[model samples]
Target: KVFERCELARTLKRLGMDGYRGISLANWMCLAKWESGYNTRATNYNAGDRSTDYGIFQINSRYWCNDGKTPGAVNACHLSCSALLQDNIADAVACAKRVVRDPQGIRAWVAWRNRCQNRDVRQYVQGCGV
Candidate 1:
C-alpha cells in the first residue's frame, strides 16, 4: 500500500511512533518518504552488503531481519524479512520499535542521518492532526 502523507503520519502516531525513544514522528515520516516513498512493498538490493533492504522502513536483511541469504546476517528483529513487506504496517512498526531500542537510536537509519537529521521535517506531519 502506498500511503498519502497525512495518512501515514496519523498511522505512525497511532502506532506509538510520536516520540518513541525521542525520535519524532516526523523524523520517521521523513524516513518513509525518502527511503521508500510510503510504499509498503518497497525493496532495495544492497550488493555491497550482499543483503536486501525490505519494506517501508527499508529494514535490512543484514542485521535487522532475515531473508535467509544475507551472509553472516543476524535476525535481530526475530521475524522474517517477508513480514516487513506487508501492507499492514503493524509488524514493520514493531520491528522499527525494536530497532530504535538499539544504541544507535534513530541514527541507525543512515537516511535519517543524511536526510532527516538537522533538517526541518515538519512538512511530513503537518496537518495530519497526529
Candidate 2:
C-alpha cells in the first residue's frame, strides 16, 4: 500500500504514534516520508551487512525482525521480516514502536536525522489535518 501522506499520518495517530516514546506525529511522518515514501512493501537489501530493511518504516532484519538469513541478527521485535511487508501496516507500526524503545529514540532512523532532524518538520503534517 502506498499511502497518501495525510492518510499515513492519520493512521499512525490511530495507532498511538503521536507521542510514542516522546517522538511526535510529525516526526514520524518525516521518517516515513524519507524511509519508504509511505510504501508498505518497501524493502532495501544491505549487501554490506547482509541484512534487509522492510516495510514503510524500514524496520531492519539486523536488530528488529528476523529473515532467517541475516548473520548475527537479533529479532528484538520478535517478528518475522515478512510481517513488515504487509499492506495492513499494523505489525509494521508495532515493530516501529519497539525500535524507539532504545536510547537513540527516533534517531534510530538515519533518514530522520539527515532530513527531518533540526528542521521545521511541520510541513510534513501541515495540511494533513492530523
Candidate 3:
C-alpha cells in the first residue's frame, strides 16, 4: 500500500509542479502517514457512517459518494484491495491530485498542514526538493 501510494503521490507531485514548484512526494507521504497510518481501511467512527474511508490518504466517502454507501461505493472500492474496495492506485492518485489542485496546487494542502500544527510535515514540505 505504501509503495503504491507513494508512487501515485510522485506522479501527483510532478503534475502539481508542472509550471511551478509544488509539494513533493515525500511531503505527501508524510501527510498520508499522519492521516491514515497508510492503512486503506482506516476510519473514524465518530465521523459517522459511510465512513469506511479507506485508502493510503484516507479520503472520506462523503467527498465522493452518498452518505451511507461508502464501503460499498465504487469510489471506495476503487481505493482498497479487500472488501468492496479494490485498491485502485489510479483512483487514489487522482484523489490526492485533486486535493492538491484545489485552491491552487498544494497551497490548500499546505494550509491544512499548517492548521494542524504539523511541523513535521511542514518541515518535510520545505525540504521536499521543491
Candidate 4:
C-alpha cells in the first residue's frame, strides 16, 4: 500500500512517533520518502550478503527481522520480515522504535544518514498540519 505524505504523517503522529524516543515526525517522513517512497510493500535484497530489508522502514533481516531463508537470523524484532510488508504498518512502527534505541539511532537507515542527517526536514511535514 502507498500513502499520501499527509496521511503518513498523521498516522505516525497517531502512533506516538511524532517525538517519541527522540525521533521527530519530520525525520521519519524524510526517512520513509528515501527508503520506500511511502510504499508499504517495499522490500530489498542485498546482493552481497543475501539479507533482506522489509517494509516502509526497510528493517533488515540480518538483525531486525526474519526472512527464514537467511541463516542465523537474529530476528530482534521477533517478527517475520513479511509482516512489515502489510499496509497496517503498526508492526513496522514498533520495530522501528527498537531500531532507534540502538547506538546508531536513525543512522541505522542508510537513507537517513545520506539524505536526512543534519538536514532540516521540517518541510516534509510543513503542509500536513501535524
Model 1 residue runs over 4 Å out of place are none
lDDT of 3 at 2: 42
Question: How far off is residue 40 in model 2, in Å?
Answer: 0.5
Better of 2 and 3 by TM-score: 2
Candidate 4 lDDT, 1-130, residue by residue in tens:
9999999999999998988778899999999999999999999888888898898988889999888877677988899998899999999999999898889888889889899999989899989979
Candidate 3 residue lDDT tens string, 5-90: 44545554665533333654556666566666555545554345545454566555644423455565444233332331334445
Could you tell me every candidate's TM-score relative to the true structure? 0.97, 0.97, 0.51, 0.96
Query: Which residue ranges in model 2 land beyond 4 Å of their true spot?
Result: none
lDDT of 4 at 20: 70
Model 1 per-residue lDDT tens digits across residues 3-112: 99999998998999999999999999999998899999988999887999998899999888989999999998999999999999999999999999999998999998
The better-scoring model by lDDT among 3 and 4 is 4
Question: For model 2, how does the per-residue alpha-carbon lDDT over 13-130 read when each residue is reduced to its tens digit?
Answer: 9999998989899999999999999999988999999999998989889999999999999999999999999988889889999999999999999999999999998988888777
lDDT at 92, model 3: 60
Ranking by lDDT: 1, 2, 4, 3
Displacement of the residue 106 alpha carbon in candidate 4, Å:
0.7
Kindly provide the TM-score of model 1 when superposed on the true structure, using C-alpha atoms: 0.97
